[PDB]
Amino acid sequence: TRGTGLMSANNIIAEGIEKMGVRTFSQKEMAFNLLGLLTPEVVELCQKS
Amino acid sequence: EQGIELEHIDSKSEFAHRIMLTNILRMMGCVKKQKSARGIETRPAQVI
Amino acid sequence: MGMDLYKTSKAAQDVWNRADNHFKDTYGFSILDIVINNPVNLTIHFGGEKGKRIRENYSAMIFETIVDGKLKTEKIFKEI
């Protein structure tokens, strides 16, 4: 991800990596993920294993 | 913590290890103790 | 009510327990935390396996009703 104070130093090669057939998320994009990880579907998937 | 290689490992890291690990544990080992008592065992806590 | 006694007669705690313990395991509520402190609202969690067992225990029941002679298979809990 990009803009956070963990990789922002590395922010300037993202464009370079995507060429290898990869995606780099905005934090708002990586936001969509773990929120979609609360979904009432999963929530069982963990309440089982 | 950046630029820290091995021989440069000291407190500031020994402090972090404890931020993430040895306190999240003690964190999670500190809600159950608040559930086990009240008997909550159908509304558990999903962890991320 | 009685909880003064539930501390005293083994024969009575042997009852209140056997009852609550069964509820908790079937519907998810002990009265020994009801009688002592009458709350205004009680929320039920349907957690993992036990939670499902119990939410169906709640939905496995029916308000049959004499209409048209129909033993009207009618839901007890509908928000469930």
CATH number at residue C65: 6.10.60.10
- The residues on A that touch C, with CB distances below 8 Å, are 47-48
Cβ-contact A46, B44 below 8 angstroms:
no
Residue C57 and residue C24: Cα distance in Å, rounded?
A: 12
Residue C48 touches partner A, C-beta closer than 8 Å: yes
Characterize B19-47 residue by residue with b for buried, 16 or more Cβ atoms within 10 angstroms of its Cβ, and e for exposed: eeeeeeeeeeeeeeeeeeeeebbbebeee
Resolution reading in Å: 2.9
Residues of B in contact with A37 (CB under 8 A): 48
Q: Is C47 on the interface with A (CB under 8 A)?
A: yes
- Give C1-68 as a DSSP string: --HHHHTT-HHHHHHHHHHHHHHHTTTS--GGGTSSS--S-------SHHHHHHHHHHHS-B---EET
Tell me the β-bridge partners of A2. A26
Contact C30, C23 (CB under 8 A): yes
Q: Which residue in B has a C-alpha nearest to residue C53's C-alpha?
A: B42
State whether residue C71 is helix, strand or coil.
strand
Token pair recorded at residue B19: 């931020």
What is the residue range of C72's domain? 40-80
> Experimental method used, please?
cryo-EM
